Design an enzyme around this catalytic site. Structure first.
Site, short mmCIF file in Angstrom:
data_model
loop_
_atom_site.label_atom_id
_atom_site.label_comp_id
_atom_site.label_asym_id
_atom_site.label_seq_id
_atom_site.Cartn_x
_atom_site.Cartn_y
_atom_site.Cartn_z
N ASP A 196 0.92 -1.23 -0.02
CA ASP A 196 0.07 0.00 -0.06
C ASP A 196 0.84 1.21 0.22
O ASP A 196 1.49 1.45 1.11
CB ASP A 196 -0.82 0.00 1.19
CG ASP A 196 -2.15 1.08 1.13
OD1 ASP A 196 -1.81 2.23 1.19
OD2 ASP A 196 -3.17 0.65 0.71
N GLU B 97 12.10 6.01 -8.23
CA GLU B 97 11.73 4.53 -8.60
C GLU B 97 11.76 3.62 -7.51
O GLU B 97 12.67 3.60 -6.58
CB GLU B 97 12.39 3.97 -9.82
CG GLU B 97 11.87 4.72 -10.97
CD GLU B 97 10.25 4.95 -11.02
OE1 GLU B 97 9.84 4.11 -11.31
OE2 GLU B 97 9.99 6.24 -10.92
N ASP C 273 -2.38 -1.55 -3.64
CA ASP C 273 -3.56 -0.63 -3.37
C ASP C 273 -3.04 0.85 -3.67
O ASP C 273 -1.78 0.99 -3.49
CB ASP C 273 -3.82 -0.64 -2.05
CG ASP C 273 -5.27 0.11 -1.78
OD1 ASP C 273 -5.96 0.59 -2.67
OD2 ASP C 273 -5.59 0.19 -0.65
N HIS D 78 -1.70 -1.54 4.60
CA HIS D 78 -2.59 -0.25 4.81
C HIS D 78 -2.41 0.63 6.12
O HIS D 78 -1.91 1.49 6.11
CB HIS D 78 -3.92 -0.52 4.33
CG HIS D 78 -4.77 0.56 4.33
ND1 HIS D 78 -4.42 1.42 3.19
CD2 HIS D 78 -5.97 1.18 4.81
CE1 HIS D 78 -5.48 2.58 3.09
NE2 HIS D 78 -6.41 2.26 3.94
MG MG Z 1 -4.08 3.81 -0.31
#
Ligand code: MG
Length: 755
Positions: A527, A565, A597, A730
């Site tokens: 995430d 990167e 995500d 997350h």
């Molecule tokens: Mg997110």
RNA sequence: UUACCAUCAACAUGGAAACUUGGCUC
RNA sequence: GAGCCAAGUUUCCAUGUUGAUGGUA
């Protein structure tokens, strides 16, 4: 376009409601022109009007959006039209210059289809607020707080795998009928001397909208010395007063000539946009209204739409289009015909996954929630907690005492051998008591398993300080408990059970597992947390399963420099996670399942064509290591609302229903999954885009794997929207971005310390 | 921050097309 | 001129999480 074959075998057929379809195409070809208006006029209203006045040469069948014009007949390579202004009779040269020849079946006509749908469903007399169109006549008024709610539709024609649809969903726009001039008049009545400071403190940072061009602006200043009889530059070196700019160029009359200006300075683009509070309106639920129970009860009741109410509003839109002769005429001159009903599909509901424990492995319910079913049976691994400490301030004897007493009560059937804690009083409620007492007790005693603290109120600086001390300074698992959580002793047993299961989780204990059908696989989630307050450090959390039952998740975080990167850091995440897998399982995983995500639809080609090649080429830091990587891109996707066909009406869909056709994109193999239990509103299915599948995965097996990983989240005792490593990475990205600001200690990374 | 879920108010990022501006440029 | 880069405007979108209300466990 082409119907891909992504369907599975198991699961029960479920009839589902959807969006709308109308563009069985009958127009021959579309010709896209760019129009130059000399002198410059930006208002789309009379620009559309003067392009309608040249219907002898342009035709009556147009599609206009202010600067790009569409015809079904080809003009000359330039057309020099003569127009007269409706305000001051200014001769304006119109330059109809052909730029493109669009085939109507191609994806370049999707902006043209959207322009013509905004035309037809603007001909229903629905006003333009923000991105969408809202009915001002089917409204409902809240006169006690000067609001209106307009039930409208966010409607966009998008081409999906089953056809080229109109995604319409029922939005509700909150229109504050009092303008910023009217709100300033109300404040000027309420406050006499300090009206300027109070209207500044309410207004700056807050968002207004100008409705004539429906543009939203954050108020960055208010300037009172300026007054709209003064002049400004109309984009090419031409002074014009604001009343002349709004009457000659926008057609409408400014009533008050004493009002100040609103300054919105954009991101550094650079230019002070000056706005009129008579034509600016605030947006938002007011601060005097959120505390009111009744007004937000009506607002919440009417925005929590059942699927029957959502489909009723969509079929109201359909009947308003079809009953309007000029709207159906304006749609049908392009060969577009709306259906008599919202589209319907036959999706499938995924089977219920059995939740396993130490001794009792139980199937779930149709509710797909096991709060009560997991706190009376033994967890699969509880390490015993003897030497732990609990910290409470001066005004929290009773709640903390009953918390530990009830914890000792409920730890019987759960399976935790809890002991009485260190009864650490906190002297007051600042940083330099909580933090100092925790590290001074940690230094003397090296056998503390879990530090539990009680925080009074909701604070971000203190919770960040406890987690900063307990993750990067002194590595020990920590639990933080609110005091308004433990205020009610009625429903306190289930939340105390969830707290005990969370402190079992942060200690390295295992709660429950699911029966993974394939073997020797390593499930990975990341995430990117994009930073809007520290200077663009897209911090990448990383969670990787390191055992065959996928219950131990070793996690690492990497920080990213601006315009750097993700090669040299996600390579380190992968090699550390494969090294940890090599220590635990003493072999190598034959599959790596990656869930991404934080990806918009324009970054799909970037993810699929840059980042998966760099990870598959950074796998060569070991000897002959070429696994079968599978990458998924997760998107909540709050546009789509599935309904369920009850024998009289539309009900909320069952938890775990998937759809893998007719809304899915044409360029990937992908699906929308409703995993959680939704009880109010229509559920939000989650888009899972398979950008890489080197494992030759079945069409059914990614559904079952993503649902099994939706069960696997240990911080909520039922199914959840995203998979478990998605929410793990997350919250790991939130910890490292908003709380820790630096990578955690590695000795905590064998446990789920971030929960 | 015991969670999770809905929907609303926004902000921010990204994509595509057309135009404009400034550099290179066969 | 073909093409590329950079920036802006206008159309069309898409995603994210910030704050709110709620819901139930
Ligand atoms: Mg997110």
């Amino acid at each position: 376009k082409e119907l891909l074959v992504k369907q599975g075998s198991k699961g029960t057929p479920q009839s589902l409601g959807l969006n709308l379809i109308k563009i069985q195409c009958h127009n021959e070809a579309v010709y896209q022109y760019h129009v130059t208006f000399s002198p410059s006029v930006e208002c789309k209203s009379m620009r559309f009007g003067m392009l309608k006045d040249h219907q002898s040469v342009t035709g009556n069948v147009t599609a206009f959006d202010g600067s790009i014009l569409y015809l079904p007949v080809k003009l000359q390579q330039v057309v020099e039209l003569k127009s007269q202004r409706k305000t001051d009779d200014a001769e304006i040269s119109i330059k109809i210059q052909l730029t493109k020849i669009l085939e109507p079946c191609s994806d370049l006509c999707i902006p043209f289809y959207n322009v013509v749908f905004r035309r037809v469903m603007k001909l229903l007399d629905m006003k333009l607020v923000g991105r969408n169109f809202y009915d001002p006549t089917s409204a409902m008024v809240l006169q006690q707080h000067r609001l209106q709610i307009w039930p409208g539709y966010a409607a966009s024609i998008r081409r999906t795998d089953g056809g080229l649809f109109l995604l319409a969903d029922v939005s509700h726009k909150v229109i504050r009928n009092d303008s910023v001039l009217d709100v300033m008049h109300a404040i000027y009545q309420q406050n006499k001397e300090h009206f300027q400071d109070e209207c500044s403190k309410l207004l700056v940072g807050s968002i207004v909208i100008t409705r004539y061009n429906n543009r939203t602006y954050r108020i960055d200043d208010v300037d009172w010395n300026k007054t709209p009889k003064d002049s400004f530059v109309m984009s090419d070196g031409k002074e014009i007063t604001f009343l002349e700019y709004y009457s000659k160029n926008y057609g409408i009359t400014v009533k008050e000539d004493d009002q100040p200006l609103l300054i919105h300075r954009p991101s550094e683009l650079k230019g002070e946009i000056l706005l009129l509070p008579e034509l600016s309106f605030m947006t938002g639920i007011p601060e005097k209204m959120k505390k009111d129970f009744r007004a937000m009860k009506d607002l919440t009741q009417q925005i929590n739409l059942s699927p029957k109410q959502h489909h009723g509003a969509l079929e109201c839109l359909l009947q308003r289009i079809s009953q309007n002769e000029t709207a159906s005429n304006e749609l049908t001159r392009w060969g577009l015909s709306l259906h008599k009903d919202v589209h319907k599909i036959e999706g499938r509901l995924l089977p219920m996954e059995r939740i396993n424990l130490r001794n009792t492995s139980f199937v779930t319910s149709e509710d797909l929630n096991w709060v009560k079913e997991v706190t009376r049976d033994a967890s699969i691994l509880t390490i015993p907690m003897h030497f732990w400490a609990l910290f409470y301030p001066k005004r929290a004897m009773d709640q903390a005492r009953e918390l530990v007493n009830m914890l000792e009560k409920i730890a019987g059937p759960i399976g935790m051998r809890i002991s009485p804690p260190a009864w650490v009083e906190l002297k007051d409620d600042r940083i330099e008591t909580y933090i100092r007492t925790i590290q001074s007790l940690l230094g003397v005693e090296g056998k503390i398993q879990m530090v539990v603290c009680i925080i009074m109120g909701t604070r971000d600086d203190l919770y960040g300080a406890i987690k900063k001390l307990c993750c990067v300074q002194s590595p020990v698992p920590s639990q933080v408990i609110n005091v308004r959580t433990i205020g009610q002793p009625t429903r306190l047993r289930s939340v105390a059970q969830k707290i005990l299961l969370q402190m079992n989780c942060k200690l390295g204990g295992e709660l429950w597992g699911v029966d993974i059908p394939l073997k020797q696989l390593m499930v990975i989630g990341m995430d990117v947390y994009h930073d809007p307050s520290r200077g663009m450090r897209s911090v990448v959390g990383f969670v990787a399963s390191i055992n065959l039952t996928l219950t131990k998740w070793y996690s690492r975080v990497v920080f990213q420099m601006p315009h750097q990167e993700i090669v040299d850091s996600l390579k380190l995440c992968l090699v550390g996670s494969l090294k940890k897998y090599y220590e635990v399982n003493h072999c190598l995983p034959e599959k790596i399942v990656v869930y991404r995500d934080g990806v918009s639809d324009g970054q799909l080609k970037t993810v699929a064509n840059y980042e998966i090649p760099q990870l598959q080429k950074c796998f060569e830091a070991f000897d002959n290591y070429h696994p079968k990587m599978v990458v998924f891109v997760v998107q909540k996707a709050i546009s789509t609302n599935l309904y369920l066909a009850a024998p009289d009406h539309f009900v909320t869909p069952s938890p775990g229903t998937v759809v893998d056709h007719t809304i899915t994109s044409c360029e990937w193999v992908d699906f929308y999954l409703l995993a959680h239990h939704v009880r109010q509103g229509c559920g939000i299915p989650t888009h899972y885009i398979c950008v890489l599948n080197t494992a030759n995965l079945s069409p059914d097996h990614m559904q079952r794997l993503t649902f099994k990983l939706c069960h696997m989240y240990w911080n909520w005792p039922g199914t959840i929207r995203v998979p478990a490593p998605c929410k793990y990475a997350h919250k790991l990205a939130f910890l490292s971005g908003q709380i820790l600001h630096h990578e955690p200690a590695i000795q905590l990374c064998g446990n789920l310390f971030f929960l």
